[PDB]
Amino acid sequence: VVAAAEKTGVLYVGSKTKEGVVHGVTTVAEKTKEQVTNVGGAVVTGVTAVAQKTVEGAGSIAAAT
Amino acid sequence: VVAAAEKTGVLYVGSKTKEGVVHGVTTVAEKTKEQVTNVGGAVVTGVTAVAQKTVEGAGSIAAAT
Amino acid sequence: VVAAAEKTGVLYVGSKTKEGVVHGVTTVAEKTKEQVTNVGGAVVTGVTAVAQKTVEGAGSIAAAT
Amino acid sequence: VVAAAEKTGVLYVGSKTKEGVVHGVTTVAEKTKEQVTNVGGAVVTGVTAVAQKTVEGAGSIAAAT
Amino acid sequence: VVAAAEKTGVLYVGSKTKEGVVHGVTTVAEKTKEQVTNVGGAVVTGVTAVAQKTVEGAGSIAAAT
Amino acid sequence: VVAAAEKTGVLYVGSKTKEGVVHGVTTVAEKTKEQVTNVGGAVVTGVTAVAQKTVEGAGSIAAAT
Amino acid sequence: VVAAAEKTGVLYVGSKTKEGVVHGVTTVAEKTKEQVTNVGGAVVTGVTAVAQKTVEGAGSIAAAT
Amino acid sequence: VVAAAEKTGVLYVGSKTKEGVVHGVTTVAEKTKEQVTNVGGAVVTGVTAVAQKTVEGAGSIAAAT
């Protein structure tokens, strides 16, 4: 289990909402052994969610659950 | 299990909503052994969700569940 | 379980909301052995959520749960 | 379990909310052995959440739970 | 203008609503001389409106607008 | 302008509402001479409005506006 | 302008509301000469409004506006 | 302008509210000569408003406005 990584205007958002229920990364279980969540990048969540120029480098994730 | 990666205007969003229910990356189970969520990139979630210039580098994920 | 990584305008957001319920990275269980959450990048959550120029370096996550 | 990492405008946010309930990184269980949360990057949570120029260095996380 | 008047169980109401906008006796004008409203009886108004055994006597209205 | 008048169980209301806007007897104008409101009986108004055994006598209204 | 009048169980209300805006007897104008409101009976107003056994005598109203 | 009047169980109210805005008898104007409000009966106003056995005698109102 090996991972490797190498590296060498106007944005207008207007929102009008009355009711907002938002879930991002969700993991639900009743009977389980393991629950694993690795976020090497970006998790952006909300009623109004904006991501600009995110995750622009080098990331690596190795999991052996 | 080996992974490897290498690397060497106007955006107007306007939204009117009354009710919004949003789920992004969801994993639901009742009987299980393992639940794995790797995000080397980006999960952007919402009633209004804008992603600009994201995940522009090098990423690697190696899972052996 | 080995991970490695190497590296060598106007943004306007206006939001009018009355009711907002937001969850970011969520892990729920009833019977389990292990619950793991590594955040090498960025988890950005809220009724208004803005991420600009985040996760631009070198990150690595190794999990052997 | 080895991890290694090496490295060598106007932002306007306006929000008008009446009710906001926000959760960031959440881990809930009823019977479990282990619960682990490593934060090497950034967790930014709130009714209004703005992250600018965060997680731009070198980070490594190694968990062998 | 003459008017004259002379006189000699289980009621279960259950209601579930989310949004209710109710008007009763309404009189709207832009250019007028006279606006008259006589209620010798009963005006009962609402999202849930119940009237039981009302206006059971003697009433008289004489208007000469 | 003459008016004359002469005279000689279980009620359960359960209501569940989230938003309620109620008007009763309303008189609106922009240019007018006279605005008259005589209530000899009963005006009952609200999100939950209940009237039981009201206006059971003698009432008279004489208006010569 | 003459008026004349002569005369010779379980009530359960349960209400669960989150937001309530109520108006009873309302008279609105911009340019006018006269504004008159006689209440010989009863005006009962509110988010929960209960009127039991009201206006059961003798009432008379005479207006010559 | 003459008026004349002559005369010879369990009530449970439960209310759970979060926000209430209530007006009873309201008279609004911008330019006017006269504004008259005679209350011979009863005006009961409130977020929870209960009237039991009110206005049971003799009442007379005479206005020559």
Amino acid at B39: V
DSSP state at residue C31? B
Experimental method: cryo-EM
Distance CA D9, CA D17 (A): 26
Closest of E20, E26, E28 to residue E47, by C-alpha: E20
Q: Decide if E26 contacts F26 (C-beta within 8 A).
A: yes
> Residue F27: which of E37, E49, E62 has the nearest Cβ?
E37
Count CB neighbours of D23 within 10 A. Answer: 18
DSSP structure string for A14-33: EEEEEEEEEEEEEEE-SB-S
Distance CA B12, CA B6 (A): 33
**Is the CB of F46 less than 8 angstroms away from the CB of H22?**
yes
CA-based radius of gyration for chain H:
17
D neighbour chains, 3+ CB pairs within 8 Å: A, C
Per residue, what are the HEC states of G5-63? Answer: EEECCEEEEEEEEEEEEEEEEEEECCECCEEEEEECCEEEECCEEEEECCCCCEEEEEE
CA atoms in the 13 A half-sphere facing the CB of A15: 31
Q: Decide if H40 contacts H61 (C-beta within 8 A).
A: yes
In chain E, which residues have their Cβ closer than 8 Å to the Cβ of G49? 46
CA-based radius of gyration for chain A:
17
Distance CA A46, CA B43 (A): 11
Closest of B15, B39, B4 to residue B25, by C-alpha: B39
**Is the CB of G27 less than 8 angstroms away from the CB of H27?**
yes
Count CB neighbours of B1 within 10 A. Answer: 14
Q: Is A39 helix (H, G, I), strand (E, B) or coil?
A: strand
Domain boundaries, chain E: 41-65
Q: Is H65 helix (H, G, I), strand (E, B) or coil?
A: coil
Distance CA F3, CA F5 (A): 7
The two three-digit tokens of residue C41, written as one number: 């990048």
Binding site listing of F = 23
How far is B22 from chain A, CA to nearest CA, in Å? 5
Q: What are phi and psi of F33, to 5 degrees?
A: -95, -50
> Residue G20: which of H4, H20, H28 has the nearest Cβ?
H20
Closest of A35, A52, A46, C39 to residue D43, by C-alpha: C39
Distance CA E39, CA D65 (A): 77
CA atoms in the 13 A half-sphere facing the CB of C38: 29
Test the G interface: residue of E7, E21, E60 with most G CBs within 10 Å? E60
> How many distinct helices (H) and strands (E) make up chain H?
0, 6
Decide if E9 touches G, using CB distance below 8 A.
no
Q: Decide if C22 contacts D21 (C-beta within 8 A).
A: yes
Query: H29 forms bridges with which residues in the sheet?
Result: none
Residues for chain D: how many in total? Answer: 65
